[PDB]
């Protein structure tokens, strides 16, 4: 019976060690799940490809057996289009830069629009800020800036 008892005790020790390993793995997974819960459901996370794929908007949790399920709502841009662009606009010998958008042109006239959605607008002094002259910036394109 000593032989059998030693064998069974070794088997129990092996099972306990495996359970501890799986407990550590589940602890890490649960910590990650709690972090994702806090950073996606209770708020908006700027960490790219953390709360789903794309630009995260909101996450809805769902209970699951021995786990949790997240419904990550993301903003995915689509239907892009070619656009010739310039880094700066020269109006009166001074360079102009976009406030929070890009400079785009449909081949005839230049426009300023937000970087994540094509919403063209007329170049205006309130849409741009002046910095320096037009001989230090590479690729600057001359164009009028409307003063309202």
């Amino acid at each position: 019976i000593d032989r059998l008892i030693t064998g069974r005790l070794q088997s129990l020790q092996t099972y306990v060690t495996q359970q501890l390993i799986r407990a550590a793995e589940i602890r890490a997974s649960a910590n990650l799940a709690a972090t994702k819960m806090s950073e996606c459901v209770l708020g908006q996370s700027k960490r790219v490809d953390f709360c789903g794929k794309g630009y995260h908007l909101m996450s809805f949790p769902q209970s699951a057996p021995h786990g949790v399920v997240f419904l990550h709502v993301t903003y995915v841009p689509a239907q892009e289009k070619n656009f010739t662009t310039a880094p700066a606009i020269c109006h009166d010998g001074k360079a102009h830069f976009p406030r929070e958008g890009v400079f785009v042109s449909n081949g005839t006239h230049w426009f300023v629009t937000q970087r994540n959605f094509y919403e063209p607008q007329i170049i205006t002094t309130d849409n741009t800020f002046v910095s320096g002259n037009c001989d230090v910036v590479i690729g600057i394109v001359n164009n009028t800036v409307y003063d309202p």
């Binding site: 993301t74 360079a95 830069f97 910095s131 690729g139």
Partner: protein
């Protein structure tokens, strides 16, 4: 020793869970690479013209002048680590001295699912996406953008106005190239 195996058969199914654990570990190792590297649905290719706002990326983009499509930095890393490896051969052809002894005791090594060439291809695709598209390729279809504009928008992200880069582009490109060269020299140094 057939009789030893016969008497070991009385020990029950103990090799079953050991084999299962080793197989699970191997699958986990494969999934680690599959998750860390295969994060792009497309293999983007850099354009033939290698001018990006004056920045120099020749040390990190792959070149076709080698049998393995790896960059200079990747080759330096491989040479630095190649002192100890699996063995580079597992076909028993040359094995009639360290791997052979372990193999003769039933201690084999399973080759990774992803070869070094495919990992290099993933890294090249990631480089192409982050150079020709910025962060847009990581959230959908890749959108082309000049590298100067991407760096200006990153400066805007760190709280620096765009005109700073558009006025110091030459200096910033020179600093980046010098830093890349310094990294290459440090990696090529004996101090691993």
């Amino acid at each position: 020793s057939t009789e030893c195996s016969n008497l070991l058969l009385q020990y029950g199914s103990f090799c079953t869970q050991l084999k299962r654990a080793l197989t699970g570990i191997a699958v986990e190792q494969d999934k680690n690479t599959q998750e860390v590297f295969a994060q792009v649905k497309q293999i983007y290719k850099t354009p033939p013209i290698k001018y990006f706002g004056g920045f120099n990326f020749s040390q990190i983009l792959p070149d076709p002048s080698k049998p393995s499509k790896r960059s200079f930095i990747e080759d330096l890393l491989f040479n630095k680590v190649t002192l100890a490896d699996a063995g580079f051969i597992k076909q028993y052809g040359d094995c009639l001295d360290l791997i052979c002894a372990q193999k003769f005791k039933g201690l084999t090594v399973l080759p990774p699912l992803l070869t070094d060439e495919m990992i290099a291809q993933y890294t090249s695709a990631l480089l192409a996406g982050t150079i020709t598209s910025g962060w847009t390729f990581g959230a959908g279809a890749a959108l082309q953008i000049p590298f100067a504009m991407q760096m200006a928008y990153r400066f805007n992200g760190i709280g620096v106005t765009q005109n700073v880069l558009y006025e110091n582009q030459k200096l910033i490109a020179n600093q980046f190239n010098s830093a890349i060269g310094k990294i290459q020299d440090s990696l090529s140094s004996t101090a691993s």
